[PDB]
Each structure stands twice: as C-alpha cells, then as structure tokens.
Design a protein around this ligand. Structure first.
Ligand code: GH3
Ligand code: CA
Ligand code: CA
Length: 1203
RNA sequence: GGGUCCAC
RNA sequence: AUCGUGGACCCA
C-alpha cells in the first residue's frame, strides 16, 4: 500500500488518469491535490509521445457549412470504439467548430491550436489520436453528405437547390469521382498513359491506327469514369451526373470527399497465430460429446487481452487436457472457441453474417488504469449485439500496491456493467495477471484457472439442437400412391417420432397433421433426429396443400409472420455483392430456409442511402408469411445473387414492368431473320475482308484452309480464326459428306485395338535379348498405378460415387433422361453387372428393378465437324449407375498426381506458358479413348480393378445397321468412366516417360486427352504411344511452335488466339445474337472495339428486329441479348433499386414428373451428401421439375448490374 | 437437375 | 432423335 485510497479517487474522477498514474503521481506530489495534476500534465506530452508510435487508421470525419462556406474534418484515432466515444466526439466537434468560425485550412494551425488539449485525451483514452487533414470549400450553393462517420463530402454548386446538392453529395460519397469533368484530368497522367497503353496493344502486332483508335477509346471511358460528369448518377444510373446537371441548368464549382483512414497503411492483424507467438516463449519455457462454447475477448488494446488469451491457453492445457482466426482451449468439461473483438463494426458484421456469434464475452480491464472512457463502448457493443453474459478479467494487478485500490476499480466496472443492464453486482471479476501466469507463477497461475472456472459455471451450457422442439424445413413434397403425402428435408432441431402430431406452417394458412412414418434411402425408421435428412410421411394432407418454404414443426412451437426488424450486412462489391448503393424503396428477395420471398423495407431514422459493406438495421415486411422467431438468419438476394445477410431481431405485428413491351420483344424473338444464302459464310467473309485477308470463295474452302504458324501474333490470330470459324458449320451443302465417315473411323479404331490386343498378349519375341521403351513404361506405369489406385475400388468409394445422371439410356430416351425417371423405370443391365444391381437391391427397401439383362449398348452418331460426326454409345442405365461410381473414385485418386478433372483452367495456363516458354508441349491423341484396347488396360490396372471394369463395361454394341460389334476397346465414348480412365492411362504413361528420362513426373498434366508434359519428353512419349496401340494426332500436337493449345484455349507466343465457331445455320434472332456476341468477345478488349471487326458487327446487327438491336446486356450474362452497355438499354427496367433487363429464353411447357421416382431420387441424393467469411451455407438444392422444349422463344426479365 | 454457351 | 464429364449464365 501507499497513500489514502480515497485521495487517488478524488484525483482520478477529476483527471481521468489511470489508477497507478494517479497513485505514483500523488506520491511524488506528497499528497498535494492541485499539485499532482500538473506533474501529470507535463507528463501527458511524454505519454502521447510514445503513443504517437502506434498506427491510428480509424477515426471520424466531420462536416460543417456556414451559409455558403463549408469545411471537412478528418480527426482520427486507432479504434472503432474510441471513434464513437463521447470524449473523442467532443474533441473532434470543437476542433471543427473552431476551424469554422476561424476559417482555417492549414492543418498545422489548429493541429497546434489544440496540441495542448490533444494530450489531454491521449492521456485519458490511451490511443494515438491526431488531426490528419483539413480542407474547406466555398461556392454559391453548397451541401454536405455524412455517411455515418466514415465518409463526408462537401459539394459546391452554382444553379442547384437544396435537394440537388444533397443528392450529388451522396453520389460523390458512393462513386469516388476524382475530377469534376473529363477534361479537368491531369493532361499529364493521361499523356503518359496513352504512350504506355499504345504499346501494350501495338506489341500484339496491331497496326498503328488500330491500336491508336483503341487506346483513344479506352481513355475516353477511362476519364469519363473517374469524373463526376461521366458517371451514371447513383440515384438514376440511366443518365449521368453530367446530364443530370444540364437538366437543372446548374453546375458544380467543385467538391471534397474524405474517407477515414484513406491511404493510411492499415496493418493486418492475425489473432490466432498472434497468441501462439506468446505461448511460445513459455511452452518451450474419450469425452467427444462435450459442448462447444464461443467466448469473446474485449477491452483496451494494450490492457493485454492478447496476453490473457495466451495465459489462458497455456495454463488450460498445461493443467487439464490438451470460426475464422480463433484460438481454442479445453476445460475438463467444455470446449472453448475464443475470438478477439477488435472493432465494433467488425463484430456486428460477424454476428449478422453468423461467422461468429458469442455465448459470453470477457471484458479485460487493467487495474493499473481502470475502466477507460471507451470501456463503455465495449460494454455497449456487448449490449447491442446481445451477448448473454459478460465476465470481467481484472488484469495487471501485481502492479497495485494497495488492494484497497483494486476494491476501487472493480467498483467502477460493476457500476458501468449495470449502467447497460448487465448484472453488475453479480458478474464475476477475477483479479489477476496474465504475464506472471505465463511465467508459471503458481499464484497468478491459479487466477487464470479461476476465470476458467467461471466460464464453466457462469456461461450456461448452449442448448443442444436435439433438445429443442421439432422443426424440419420442407424442401419438397411428394404424393405417392399407397403411402400418402411425404416431405423431405434435413431435420433442423429436435426429434420426430412416428405417431406424433405436427403442424405445417409457413406460406399458407397453417395446417396440422400426424407423422405416419420416417424414411431414408437405405432403411425405414421410427424417428428422425436433428441433423438427419429424411422423408416424413403425413396423414390426410393433400400434396398441393404443402409447399417448399413451409416448415414442419411441433405444434404451436413456431408461428407465421410477415413483419419484423433486423440487422443486416450488405455485401461489399469485393465480396460478390452489389456495387451500387440503394435507397428508400429497396425491393430484393429474402431467402429464409429453403425459398425466396419478396419484401419491402423501411430504413432507420435519418438514413437515406445504403452502400455495399454497410451494416444496417431495417424493418422488413414480406409479401407473405414465413415461420420465424428471433435469431432466424437469412440471406438477401437479387435473382440468384446473394447481396446481403441478416438475422431477425424482433418480430412485429404485421397487418415496374411492361405489357405490350415484353410482348413486343417476344414477337421480335419469334421472328425469323431472313436472308439469301449462307448468312454465316457472308459474315465470315466480311470479317476476313475487314482484316485484309482473302475471303473463302466457296463452301469447300471453309473447311480446307491451313494457318501459317508464323507471322506476328496479330496476323496469326485472324489466320487461325479463318482456319477455324467455319470448320464445324453443320449446314454445308456442297459435300456428299456423311456420318459414314464417322463409322469408318469408329471401325478403324476397333481394328487397331484388335492388332494391339493380339500383339500385347504375346510379347515373347524369341528371348530376353531385346528390351524396349514401351514394354518398360508399361511395367513402370503398372507399378505406379497400383500405388495410386488400390488392388480394388473401395466399397466406400463406390458407395459415394454411384448415381444416375443425365440423358438417354438403353431403356430411356432424352425426354426420360432425368434421374427420377431412371429410378421410376426399370433400367437395363449387363450380364456381368447384375450382381451390382442385386447388391444395391439388398441395401434398400425401395424397389430396384431391372428391365432386361442384355450385353448390348446402342452405338449412335453425334455431331462434330463439318466433315465427320462422332460415334457415341448409349449405355444400359444400371451399368451407367456403376460406371460413374468408378469414374468418381478415379477422379479423386488422380488428385494425388496433381491431376484435377474439375478444372480445365489449369491446362489452359500451361498451354499459355508453353507458347511463351517452349518448355511444355501440348499433345493430342487421334481416337483417344476409342484406341485404349482391352490388352493395354489389362496390363496396367490391378486385376481387382480390371475385373470390375469388365463387369461394368458394355461388351457389345448394336449399330444403326442392326450389326453387332464385340468391343476390342476397353470402353466406348459414353461410358461412365471412359473419360477418367483415359486420363489415368495417359498420365501414367507420360509420368513413366518422365521418370525414364529423368524429368519430374509433376510436370505432367492431363485432362482427358489434353496432355501436357515437358517438350523433351515428346519423342519418347510418341514412341511409347505407338507401342501401346495409340496414334498421336501429329496435326494437333505442338512441342516446338510459338503455338500451344489446351482445353479450348489457343495461344501464340502468349497472346490469346482462341477463335470462335459458327456452328449452325443462322435462322432466328437468338442464332444471330450468339454469333455477334461471339464476335464481340473475340474482337473486344475490355469493352473496346477493334475497329476492323466493329464495322462487320454493325452491319449484321441490322438484320435483327429493331427492338432487339438496342436490347443490350453486360458480358457474363449469357446470350439472350446483345452484349453491350446496359445503362443505354431502353428496355432496362429499374425496379426497387434493382435493374431488370429482358433476355430471350427458350420457351418451355410443363410435363408431369414421376412422383415415386423423384422421391427416390431425393432420398438417394441426401444419402450421398452424408457419405461425403462463409455464409453461402444459407441455401439448398432444388425440386425435380420436368419440362419440354417447344421450339419458340420467350422473354425473361433478369437481375442485372452495370459490371 | 433443365435451357444456353464454351470445352475434353 | 442427341452418351459421359467439366466450367460459366440464366432459370429453377
Ligand atoms: N462421352 C464423350 N466423350 C468425349 C466427347 N468429346 C470428347 N470426348 C472425350 O475426350 C477425348 C477427346 O476427344 P477429342 O480429342 O475431341 O477427339 P478424338 O476422339 O481423340 O479424335 P480426334 O482428335 O482425332 O478428333 C476423347 C473422349 O473420351 C464427347 O462429345 N462425348
Ligand atoms: Ca484427340
Ligand atoms: Ca486435345
């Protein structure tokens, strides 16, 4: 102890100084009141001194307007909480007011006019806070916008009234225009920018005026975009601010916008790792049902909430046992996850988003100082975010002489806690020291344990989902004869035993029923527990009386509501959200558990605009009811895109478009564009002419032209286009061409597998004597394959990959290709595959039927080139079901060889690399999979795998002839594993060739038959390939050009030269629009036209119905309209702050689905799930609906966004 | 899972 | 009448 404790208190609640700083400073003043104050004053500067070391990236912006003189203020601090603290507020307010009356604009004048009072706060608050920048603006009429505290703007305008400047001050706030007019721009920044960009493209080989006209064009936009004038007005994006101004014959003499912490470095912080940094210097020196508890640490930055979390972690594993950046520690009875709450807006975001709710927090104040002023905001955060419980850890107590002075701090904190309706008198306050606890000081060491004790007994145990009342969100409803109505979904809370009664509540007038049963795909069941996907059978309720969106619940347990208040986070542009602000009548979709519902909102008192990234409270009223109570999370959507997240906070009491304009566009769409001859050919020739190349002078030329693999990238680009553009056109007349050539090819491959099948089952040449590269690779590949693949396909593996999907089987036509029809209609199967079906039949109570048991698949023909089709075979359904099982296991395994058959994007980039580097080759095989013979396959794969492949393939094929083939190849295109299998065979060979040549196997990459491996390996790979029956496509393999190509991307010395194809006769406006869009994407850099192609574009644009020539959409939205500028689009309809544009759609009619088949398909899928910053988890997977395509077009409005 | 696009 | 796989956009 030292001096009277009652005296320090008098000093503190007079000065706002830390406890110990009041003590030691009162000890040297010999107990002199008005004296101690000064010793601290003169010190307040040395304090701020060491303070001004810390980065202060947070703060506020303030704004003041006197008649027609205004000023913008940027005083900032280092924390959210300080930013909204009364004291910091009052400083910033005064430092502003004082800068108004005294029209100051010199940062350093007031920066010093207050330097005195600035140490005043910095002492008290204990964060570096400095005036950053000031500026002032005068104009004839001016107006300010304040976007919370984070952005302020001053706008000076001549000719405009109150509303005008308000509105364009808001726009400046949203759209960061760095200049008032496109010409204002630094004729320098733009000068060298046009000299830099004039090569980037002139290096393509683009002729002078071509790259000149293009660069010019960009910078016309480039400047228009960063300029208030040429910006789409934020409250009216169809017209620009420029045009808006000119409509009120007014103008902006200038503007200012400051944003808190702009340009400040703003250091990243990693809490998790960060702790392990402190638990390092010290660490060196089955209860699996235990509940998980989320706790939060919150307090003053250097009061050491960090050091504590460290002390907690060490001591808690040193003694007892052993989302997103969260340390976690274990207690004999509970498991804790622990996050730091560094900022107020950050936490509110994570609470809404769900990426971190919290069961209890721990407030960390140092007894050295005591509550800070911003300590109230810490607690206030807790109150506003609804933390149920707050524990206090009093830290740094070893540095408190008088324990009567701890009695004092603990008092202030209870007093605050209670001021915010927390149970102050009753909240645990452990008095300890994190630091001495890391230094294994058994005393202070047990105080941590103590605090932990409170976490166990003070924060109550979170209700297990199973302990809650029953609720299942209905995903789909089926009517099954002789079973009744049944709903499927995942049970969210509780248990439902057959017998029990249930309400079905949500969209309609709530209804009641009883549980007739509970089933999964494998077994029937008598109850469904939380977390289980199930069907639930219901008694007496028709299936047109249930609806996705409704919930199934224990009766009275949940109610339907329409109006409620919430806290939402609006996604930033960054995070895939809106890029434009919205306003009063925002009208999006609210996605609850399993469905969207339209709803209007009302903003809070005084907020008029919302920006991507904003938290906000809003009151939401829905177009019809949804079952809900407090805590229900939801997503905000714009036609499929997720733009925000929210949680219901308190449920309340509840209570455009175009007709003969869509009709106009629909008529246009079903119009038939009509011309003379081959419109495609005409377009291709007009293109070639515009690039000064000879046209095709006949149909027969369009498919027989070879490029020159030299010349500049630009020359080559149009050459390759010319070689490819018409190469797959399906409507040439000139030609007795047929699918005859396809079947010839199909027979040639079989004949080749017949050779290699004989050769490879007889390689006793005479004697060992001679050794060969091929023989060796097969041996090398075999062994490596076995290592990757197993002796046999796991039963788990197959159980998580088998499934139906897609199109026609031997028993179903395209119409009945949906999985639900494969389950509802008996599928054919192969003699050797029958046991698989039976094993399936034995594992489920559902009927598993086979229609016929033959060894045939159906070989048909399918389009490919202008000069040949491609022979496919349609499999028996049950065989397909299992072929996909092995195809899915091979897919996974290949991931261990760096092969990823989900991402063609990795092959495209190595093709680009290869064309610049010449170290990687791209190779193609001729009849890639058709050439993989039985023999090769039998030598490479484990016998276990080979037998299974043999059970699962179709051994025979019946052709359109009626003729048969007994397959020489291991499998045909159309099989459910041929693709993954061919990928494996090719990879293993190429990898083996690498090892034999002393290259790295990892350099080998394969997507089906798109092979990429080091250029030096090619001659040896060619040799191996020849040996094993393959024939490499010398025309499509490149190991030495400037040219590469893989998975649809073509490169010439790094430049993208992938072409586009006119595949069909152009007959409808949709046909023409695709072609023109394909031209657009081919000839367009960043929305800017190569002029050579533009001319051809505008010519054929004219062949479209007129409305359709102006109906434009942004790229990335398909081809139901011309890709162009959407702001120009006259048919655009902005509705509720979301932009709807109409696109052409293929028009469909509904068809009846198969009820049992769909139900089976549903349960089967849920069975699959179970066998195998993130909030997108707020969505599902959709009901089976069947539809037939009529041959007409429809018009669909869709949600759109400038970019 | 459909329609479309682009690919293996 | 149009097999298997992947990716994107719209639907759903
Ligand atoms: N089931 C199926 N597989 C395909 C299809 N297209 C390509 N593939 C698969 O990927 C491999 C690549 O085929 P392609 O390179 O286009 O043709 P190819 O059979 O090897 O013949 P070629 O190069 O001589 O034209 C072969 C085949 O397994 C297809 O349309 N259906
Ligand atoms: Ca090929
Ligand atoms: Ca290829």
């Amino acid at each position: 102890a030292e001096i009277t404790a009652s005296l320090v208190k008098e000093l503190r609640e007079r000065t706002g100084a830390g406890m110990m700083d009041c003590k030691k400073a009162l000890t040297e003043a010999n107990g002199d009141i008005e004296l101690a104050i000064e010793n601290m004053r003169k010190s307040g500067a040395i304090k701020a001194a060491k303070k001004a070391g810390n980065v202060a990236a947070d703060g506020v912006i303030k704004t003041k307007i006197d008649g027609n003189y205004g000023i913008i203020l940027e005083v900032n601090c280092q924390t959210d909480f300080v930013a909204k603290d009364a004291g910091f507020q009052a400083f910033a307010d005064k430092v502003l007011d004082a800068a108004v009356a005294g029209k100051i604009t010199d940062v350093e004048v007031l920066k010093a006019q207050f330097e005195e009072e600035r140490v005043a706060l910095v002492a008290k608050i204990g964060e570096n806070i400095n005036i950053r920048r000031v500026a002032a603006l005068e104009g004839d009429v001016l107006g300010s916008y304040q976007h919370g505290a984070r952005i302020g703007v001053l706008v000076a305008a001549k000719g405009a009234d109150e509303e005008l400047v308000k509105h364009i001050a808001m726009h400046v706030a949203a759209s960061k225009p760095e200049f008032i007019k496109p010409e204002d721009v630094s004729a320098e920044v733009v000068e060298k920018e046009y000299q830099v960009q004039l090569d980037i493209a002139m290096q393509s080989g683009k002729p002078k005026e071509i790259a000149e006209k293009m660069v010019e064009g960009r910078m016309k936009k480039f400047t228009g975009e960063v300029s208030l004038t040429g910006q789409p007005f934020v409250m009216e994006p169809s017209k620009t601010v420029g045009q808006l101004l000119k409509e009120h014959n007014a103008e902006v003499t200038g503007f200012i916008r400051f944003e808190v912490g702009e340009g400040i470095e703003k250091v990243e912080t990693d809490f998790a790792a960060e702790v392990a940094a402190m638990s390092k210097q010290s660490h060196m020196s089955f209860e699996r049902t235990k509940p998980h508890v989320n706790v939060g640490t919150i307090g003053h930055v250097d009061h050491g909430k960090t050091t504590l979390t460290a002390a907690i972690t060490t001591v808690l594993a040193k003694t007892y046992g052993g989302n997103t950046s969260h340390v976690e520690y274990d207690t004999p009875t509970r498991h804790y996850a622990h996050v730091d709450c560094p900022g107020h807006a950050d936490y509110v975001k994570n609470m809404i988003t769900g990426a971190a709710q919290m069961d209890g927090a721990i407030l960390v104040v140092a007894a050295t100082d005591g509550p800070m002023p911003q300590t109230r905001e810490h607690i206030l955060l807790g109150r506003q975010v609804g933390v149920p419980y707050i524990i206090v850890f009093l830290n740094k107590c070893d540095m408190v002489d008088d324990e009567e002075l701890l009695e004092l701090v603990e008092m202030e904190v209870r007093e605050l806690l209670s001021q915010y309706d927390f149970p102050g008198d009753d909240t645990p306050i452990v008095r300890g020291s994190a630091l001495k606890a890391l230094e294994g000081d058994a005393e202070w060491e047990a105080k941590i344990l103590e605090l932990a004790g409170f976490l166990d007994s003070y924060i109550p145990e979170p209700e297990r989902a199973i302990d809650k009342p029953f609720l299942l969100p209905i995903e789909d409803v089926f009517s099954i004869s002789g079973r009744g109505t049944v709903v499927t979904g995942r049970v969210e809370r509780g248990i439902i035993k057959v017998g029990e009664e249930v309400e079905i509540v949500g969209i309609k007038e709530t209804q009641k029923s009883t549980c007739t049963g509970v089933e999964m795909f494998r077994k029937l069941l008598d109850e469904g527990r939380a977390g289980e996907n199930v069907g639930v059978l219901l008694r007496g309720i028709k299936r047109e009386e249930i609806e996705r969106g409704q919930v199934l619940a224990k009766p009275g347990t949940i109610k339907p509501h329409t109006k409620f208040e919430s806290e939402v986070y609006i996604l930033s542009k960054d995070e895939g959200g809106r890029h434009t602000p919205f306003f009063k009548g925002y009208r999006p979709q609210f996605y609850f558990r399993t469905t969207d519902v339209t709803g209007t909102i009302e903003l809070p008192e005084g907020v008029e605009m919302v920006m991507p990234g904003d938290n906000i409270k809003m009151v939401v009223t829905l177009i019809h009811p949804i079952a809900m109570d407090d805590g229900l999370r939801f997503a905000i959507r714009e036609g499929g895109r997720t733009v925000g997240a929210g949680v219901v906070a308190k449920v309340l009491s509840g209570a455009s478009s175009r007709n003969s304009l869509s009709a106009q566009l629909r008529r246009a769409a079903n119009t038939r564009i009509e011309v003379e001859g081959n419109l495609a050919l005409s377009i291709a020739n007009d293109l070639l002419l515009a690039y000064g190349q000879s046209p095709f002078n006949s149909e027969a030329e369009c498919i027989s032209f070879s490029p020159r693999f030299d010349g500049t990238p630009d020359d080559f680009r149009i050459n390759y286009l010319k070689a490819e553009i018409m190469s797959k056109y399906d409507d040439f007349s000139l030609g007795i061409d047929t699918e005859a050539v396809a079947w010839e090819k199909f027979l040639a491959a079989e004949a080749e597998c017949a050779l290699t099948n004989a050769r490879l089952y007889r390689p006793d040449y005479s004697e060992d004597f001679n050794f060969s590269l091929g023989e060796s690779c097969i041996h090398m590949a075999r062994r490596k394959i076995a290592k990757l693949i197993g002796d046999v396909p796991s039963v788990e593996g197959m159980l998580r990959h088998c499934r139906f999907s897609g199109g026609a089987t031997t028993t179903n036509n395209r119409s009945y290709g949906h999985p639900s029809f494969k389950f509802a209609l008996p599928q054919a199967c192969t003699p050797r595959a029958l046991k698989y079906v039976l094993a399936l039949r034995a594992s489920t109570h559902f009927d598993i039927r086979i229609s016929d048991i033959s060894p045939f698949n159906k070989a048909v023909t399918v389009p490919k080139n202008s000069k040949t089709d491609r022979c496919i075979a349609i499999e028996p359904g049950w065989n397909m079901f299992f072929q996909l099982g092995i195809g899915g296991i091979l897919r996974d395994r290949l991931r261990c060889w760096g092969i990823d058959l989900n991402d063609q994007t990795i092959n495209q980039r190595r093709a680009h690399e290869g064309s610049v580097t010449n170290n990687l080759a791209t190779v193609d095989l001729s009849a890639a999979s058709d050439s993989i013979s039985l023999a090769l396959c039998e030598l490479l794969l484990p016998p276990g795998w080979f037998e299974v492949l043999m059970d699962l393939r179709s051994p025979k094929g019946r052709l359109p002839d009626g003729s048969v083939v007994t397959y020489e190849k291991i499998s045909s295109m159309g099989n459910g594993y041929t693709f993954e299998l061919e990928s494996l065979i090719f990879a293993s060979l190429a990898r083996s060739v690498c090892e034999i040549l002393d290259l790295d196997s990892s350099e080998v990459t394969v997507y089906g038959d798109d092979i990429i491996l080091p250029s030096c390996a090619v001659p040896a790979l060619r040799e191996v390939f020849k040996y094993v029956g393959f024939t490499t496509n010398t025309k499509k393999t490149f190991s030495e050009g400037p040219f590469r190509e893989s998975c649809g991307k073509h490169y010439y010395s790094g430049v993208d030269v992938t072409p586009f194809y006119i595949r069909h006769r152009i007959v409808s406006p949709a046909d023409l629009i695709l072609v023109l869009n394909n031209l657009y994407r081919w000839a367009t850099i960043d929305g800017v036209w190569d002029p050579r192609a533009h001319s051809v574009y505008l010519k054929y644009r004219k062949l479209l119905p007129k409305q359709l020539q102006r109906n434009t959409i942004p790229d990335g939205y398909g081809d139901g309209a011309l890709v162009g500028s959407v702001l120009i689009n006259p048919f655009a309809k902005n509705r509720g702050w979301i932009r709807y544009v109409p696109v052409i759609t293929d028009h469909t009619r509904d068809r009846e689905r198969a009820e049992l088949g769909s139900y089976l398909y549903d349960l089967f899928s849920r069975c699959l799930s179970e066998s195998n910053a993130i909030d997108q988890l707020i969505c599902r997977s959709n009901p089976t609906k069947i539809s037939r395509s009529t041959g007409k077009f429809d018009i669909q409005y869709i949600a759109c966004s400038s970019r």
